Design a protein around this nucleic acid. Sequence first.
DNA 1: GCTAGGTCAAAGGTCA
DNA 2: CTGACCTTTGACCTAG
DNA 3: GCTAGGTCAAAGGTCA
DNA 4: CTGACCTTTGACCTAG
Lengths: 84, 84, 5
Amino acid sequence: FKFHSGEKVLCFEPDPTKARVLYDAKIVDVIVGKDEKGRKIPEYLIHFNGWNRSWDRWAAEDHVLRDTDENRRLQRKLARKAVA
Amino acid sequence: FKFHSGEKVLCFEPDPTKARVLYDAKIVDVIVGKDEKGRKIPEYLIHFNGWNRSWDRWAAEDHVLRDTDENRRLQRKLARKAVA
Amino acid sequence: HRKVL
DNA sequence: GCTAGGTCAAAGGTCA
DNA sequence: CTGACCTTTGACCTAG
DNA sequence: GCTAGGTCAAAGGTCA
DNA sequence: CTGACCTTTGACCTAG
């Protein structure tokens, strides 16, 4: 699908109760999964750079951004919000 | 929430790949769960009348209907579609 | 219960 | 600074 | 092969 | 004390 | 005529 194993990406904080920020991350595994209505949807196991594997989280495509100038800009912008 | 343990209800087929029909069922257990965005949502363990406990499925509120004249009418209507 | 604010 | 309890997500095994 | 359940394995958090 | 759960046996339905 | 299997109920215990 949109991202592939090995790919370096940006990924949203997987924990809802925490500041919405973007972490540098890596696709560890992809997996065809299934929506509530049985449609094939991809799932992505994500590794958070600089944290060890025990921090790896399953995330929906929604939650994973391409490592792009524009997404990096969005990273910095969310990073400032969270500190302030 | 909307339904309670012990309550007799109608419940949608929980299996997407099967005919959309309504089964007579019973709320076995309710459970406060959490949505993708961490909001509290109720989950309901449903028992399907006439099938044994090994067929019990967790279902979202969406999937559970009150045992009502109007819902019984809907049941019959879906049941006819499914046979035809 | 997780990580950083 | 530390430790003890609870709790969470992942992963794996069992049961029918 | 699936869904439910239970258990183990790290790691956190909040108490004390 | 009362409550919600869990286990259990009695009893009636349907089916093959 | 019988046994398997499901439901609903009333009894009971226990944990909180």
